[PDB]
Amino acid sequence: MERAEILGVGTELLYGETLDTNTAEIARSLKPYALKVERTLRVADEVAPLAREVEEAFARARLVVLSGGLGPTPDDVTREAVALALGEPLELDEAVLGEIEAFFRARGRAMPEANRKQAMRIPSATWLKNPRGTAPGWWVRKGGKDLVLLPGPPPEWRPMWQEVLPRLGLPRRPYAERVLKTWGIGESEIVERLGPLFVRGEEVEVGTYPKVHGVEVVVRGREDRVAELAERIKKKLLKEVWGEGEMTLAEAVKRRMEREGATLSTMESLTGGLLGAEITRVPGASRFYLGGVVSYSVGAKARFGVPQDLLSRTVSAETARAMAEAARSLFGSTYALATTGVAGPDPLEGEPPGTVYVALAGPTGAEVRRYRFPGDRETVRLRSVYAALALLVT
Amino acid sequence: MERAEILGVGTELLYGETLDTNTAEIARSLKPYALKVERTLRVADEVAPLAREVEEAFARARLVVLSGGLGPTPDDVTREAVALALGEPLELDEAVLGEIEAFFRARGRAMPEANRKQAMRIPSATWLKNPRGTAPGWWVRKGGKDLVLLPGPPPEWRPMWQEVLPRLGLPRRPYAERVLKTWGIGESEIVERLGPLFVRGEEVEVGTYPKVHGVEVVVRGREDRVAELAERIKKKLLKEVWGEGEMTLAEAVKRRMEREGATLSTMESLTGGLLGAEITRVPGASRFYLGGVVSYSVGAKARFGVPQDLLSRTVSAETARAMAEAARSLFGSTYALATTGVAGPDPLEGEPPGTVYVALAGPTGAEVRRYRFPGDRETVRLRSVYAALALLVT
Ligand SMILES: Nc1ncnc2c1ncn2[C@@H]1O[C@H](COP(=O)(O)OP(=O)(O)OC[C@H]2O[C@@H](O)[C@H](O)[C@@H]2O)[C@@H](O)[C@H]1O
Ligand SMILES: Nc1ncnc2c1ncn2[C@@H]1O[C@H](COP(=O)(O)OP(=O)(O)OC[C@H]2O[C@@H](O)[C@H](O)[C@@H]2O)[C@@H](O)[C@H]1O
Ligand SMILES: [Mg+2]
Numbered sequence: 121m122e123r124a125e126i127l128g129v130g131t132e133l134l135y136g137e138t139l140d141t142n143t144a145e146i147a148r149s150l151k152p153y154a155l156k157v158e159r160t161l162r163v164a165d166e167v168a169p170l171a172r173e174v175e176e177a178f179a180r181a182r183l184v185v186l187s188g189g190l191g192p193t194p195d196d197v198t199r200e201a202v203a204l205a206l207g208e209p210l211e212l213d214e215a216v217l218g219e220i221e222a223f224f225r226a227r228g229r230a231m232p233e234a235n236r237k238q239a240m241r242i243p244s245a246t247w248l249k250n251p252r253g254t255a256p257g258w259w260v261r262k263g264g265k266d267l268v269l270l271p272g273p274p275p276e277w278r279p280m281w282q283e284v285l286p287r288l289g290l291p292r293r294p295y296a297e298r299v300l301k302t303w304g305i306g307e308s309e310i311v312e313r314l315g316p317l318f319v320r321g322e323e324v325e326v327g328t329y330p331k332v333h334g335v336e337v338v339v340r341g342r343e344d345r346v347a348e349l350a351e352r353i354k355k356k357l358l359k360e361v362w363g364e365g366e367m368t369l370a371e372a373v374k375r376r377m378e379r380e381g382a383t384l385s386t387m388e389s390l391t392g393g394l395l396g397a398e399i400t401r402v403p404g405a406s407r408f409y410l411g412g413v414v415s416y417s418v419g420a421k422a423r424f425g426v427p428q429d430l431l432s433r434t435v436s437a438e439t440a441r442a443m444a445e446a447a448r449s450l451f452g453s454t455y456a457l458a459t460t461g462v463a464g465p466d467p468l469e470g471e472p473p474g475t476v477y478v479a480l481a482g483p484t485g486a487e488v489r490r491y492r493f494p495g496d497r498e499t500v501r502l503r504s505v506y507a508a509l510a511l512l513v514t
Numbered sequence: 515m516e517r518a519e520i521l522g523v524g525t526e527l528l529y530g531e532t533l534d535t536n537t538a539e540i541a542r543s544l545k546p547y548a549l550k551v552e553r554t555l556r557v558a559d560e561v562a563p564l565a566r567e568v569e570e571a572f573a574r575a576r577l578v579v580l581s582g583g584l585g586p587t588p589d590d591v592t593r594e595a596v597a598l599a600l601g602e603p604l605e606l607d608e609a610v611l612g613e614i615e616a617f618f619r620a621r622g623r624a625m626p627e628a629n630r631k632q633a634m635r636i637p638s639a640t641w642l643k644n645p646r647g648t649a650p651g652w653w654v655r656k657g658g659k660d661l662v663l664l665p666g667p668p669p670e671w672r673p674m675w676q677e678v679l680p681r682l683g684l685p686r687r688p689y690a691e692r693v694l695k696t697w698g699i700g701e702s703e704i705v706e707r708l709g710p711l712f713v714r715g716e717e718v719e720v721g722t723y724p725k726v727h728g729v730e731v732v733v734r735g736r737e738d739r740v741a742e743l744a745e746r747i748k749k750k751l752l753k754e755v756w757g758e759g760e761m762t763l764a765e766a767v768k769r770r771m772e773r774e775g776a777t778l779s780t781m782e783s784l785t786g787g788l789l790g791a792e793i794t795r796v797p798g799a800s801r802f803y804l805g806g807v808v809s810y811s812v813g814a815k816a817r818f819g820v821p822q823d824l825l826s827r828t829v830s831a832e833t834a835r836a837m838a839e840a841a842r843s844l845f846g847s848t849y850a851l852a853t854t855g856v857a858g859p860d861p862l863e864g865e866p867p868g869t870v871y872v873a874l875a876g877p878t879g880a881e882v883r884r885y886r887f888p889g890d891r892e893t894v895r896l897r898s899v900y901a902a903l904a905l906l907v908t
């Protein structure tokens with residue numbers, strides 16, 4: 121098995137000022153291909169060391185993938201280092217320069233001189249278009265080997281990588297991963313519910329991964345084994361599984377609302393807006409989500425329809441019900457969600473951080489669910505958002 | 515300046531099954547010393563590739579540090595790789611083996627035979643005690659160079675490292691770093707404004723880090739050189755610096771509101787609640803943040819005060835101003851922020867994705883800023899949140 125080598129470029133990655141997730145994500149994407157990943161590197165933004173590491177990775181590898189340092193600044197040296205490592209001159213491509221200039225023109229700016237180096241390439245490179253930023257990537261095919269340069273930000277490189285990857289002509293191997301997403305059941309109860317299905321052979325293996333949106337059950341390995349094992353696991357957890365793969369609670373809610381021709385609105389306290397944020401993260405949200413209130417003060421709560429009598433007891437089922445009913449009446453939506461409780465770090469009304477009520481008001485009345493969540497302030501806010509969503513799709 | 519090499523060992527680190535914080539944490543611990551970290555590696559649990567990387571690392575470095583693979587399983591091969599890489603045989607230390615047998619006896623168990631190999635070390639190694647786990651570390655002094663082996667778990671290695679590090683006799687250099695957080699200036703303008711200040715020497719260097727919350731400018735290296743160069747730099751960027759170090763936009767906004775005794779509300783369209791969520795992320799936000807509305811439907815935009823005549827150009831500076839003025843009136847807050855625009859993927863009102871207006875209303879009036887953000891839907895939404903917060907801290 122030939123090697124894939126994967127280098128994250130950036131001094132800030134060495135120190136973990138940002139944690140390098142790119143090399144790992146790229147390693148994971150390579151699992152359906154018959155390439156060995158023996159190591160990954162993070163490399164400082166310095167031309168001579170980077171060139172040395174690139175030259176060495178390329179010598180030993182079928183595929184070398186770099187991310188980062190394609191920007192316009194003196195700390196962005198990946199293109200100069202790669203051209204040094206491959207023994208090729210960097211050449212300005214006028215057409216790409218024109219494209220960057222147009223990108224700045226559209227935004228009402230003249231292109232600064234520093235951007236020019238983003239349009240440089242070596243003879244062996246073809247361009248990988250980047251509609252999400254100013255630095256296009258490179259794909260170098262040379263001597264039967266591939267070297268791919270990607271911009272550092274994941275929102276920019278992910279769809280570039282996704283497109284180039286099948287074009288590389290890499291040898292395949294039958295791998296698959298199936299992600300089964302559950303809610304309201306702990307790791308232990310899942311293991312025990314599965315029993316012999318909880319396989320950990322080298323052909324195929326099952327794992328449990330607790331997340332803020334519930335425990336994932338992940339099946340990975342040889343594609344045939346994954347498909348069959350995942351089917352059987354899915355049956356054992358049929359009541360707990362709310363979606364798979366790319367499905368999210370926010371998208372499942374969207375599917376339900378569009379199936380019913382229904383609308384949704386929200387009123388939030390401790391989640392601060394994060395619930396409306398999560399609903400609207402999914403394209404098409406405006407077809408059903410009418411909007412929401414962030415009632416983060418007594419005055420706002422009263423103004424938008426929560427009864428005076430409840431205002432001094434916010435950590436309660438009665439409050440979560442009244443807020444969902446207030447939202448529904450204010451927006452006239454088919455359904456409304458509410459969140460109230462203690463995020464942390466301080467207790468509130470004698471209740472510890474993590475004490476949360478979420479409520480759903482619909483045509484047939486209201487329901488409330490109480491949780492006691494583990495985690496710091498941000499984690500409790502997150503789990504509260506997924507718990508309110510779960511009211512509609514679990 | 516000589517090199518320090520840092521290798522995290524473990525196949526799971528390559529794929530992100532375990533997130534490699536060890537290598538970065540060790541690199542940060544080395545900042546007080548005159549050593550260059552050019553790269554960090556993560557390496558698979560295989561004895562041949564691991565020994566090759568250790569050999570290469572040791573050859574080029576004054577210091578090598580490894581973590582992980584000190585366990586008792588067949589996949590724990592770090593001791594074997596180091597011995598191989600350094601051309602020395604492993605030797606059983608009978609006293610350490612008795613300590614391991616004590617560890618298992620201390621918990622009512624015989625020592626499994628697999629744990630025997632944890633008492634092996636090479637002649638050039640002294641032991642590093644581990645009172646938290648069974649694997650002692652190594653300190654190898656050889657050829658005026660140091661190589662340290664540490665166990666994978668942070669609670670085990672952290673005290674071990676802190677104890678051995680000041681014994682290694684590493685050359686010290688007075689280190690400092692300064693992080694300047696900017697908004698509303700791109701990397702190229704920064705390059706041009708700074709010009710020759712954008713130093714990249716061995717004693718001191720300047721870097722930029724483009725984030726969704728704006729460009730961070732980092733100066734790091736010799737203590738006297740960093741203070742002067744960062745002061746000059748901050749003076750060149752005075753209008754655009756809104757914070758330093760650990761400061762965040764949400765915290766900066768909190769500071770201003772507490773300084774003035776002022777309150778804040780929001781009205782959001784495209785950001786969907788994300789702006790409220792970012793404001794309330796910081797503990798103590800309830801002292802100034804009254805709440806907000808998410809006016810996602812045209813009906814909600816009209817309900818919360820956007821004038822009828824603007825509902826056909828909700829993506830405009832006039833509407834953003836009207837939304838901020840409405841929120842301010844609706845909540846009776848000192849200030850209000852509003853967001854409106856085109857998140858993507860589809861255009862809206864003829865305007866392309868990334869077209870965003872943010873506005874601030876206060877006692878002295880309202881103001882609006884327009885942006886054209888490249889990026890996918892989630893990125894446009896995030897940038898808009900920070901753009902709105904930047905109106906209050908410039
Ligand atoms: N290994 C990594 N893992 C996770 N995130 C990363 C990594 N490397 C970079 N990032 C993220 O990307 C950010 C920018 O990293 P750079 O290396 O500077 O990316 P660069 O390739 O130079 O491009 C920067 C910007 O310039 C534009 O022309 C280009 O389109 C991009 O918008 C980092 O601050 C970090 O948030
Ligand atoms: N680079 C890393 N970054 C962060 N955490 C890490 C890293 N490497 C390991 N860890 C953490 O430590 C855990 C164990 O990693 P191993 O490499 O297996 O640790 P190892 O040195 O082999 O020792 C494991 C156990 O065996 C004992 O004898 C030894 O004392 C330790 O208790 C990992 O699951 C992870 O939680
Ligand atoms: Mg860059």
Ligand SMILES: [Mg+2]
Nearest residue numbers: 583584585590
């Ligand atoms: Mg181990």
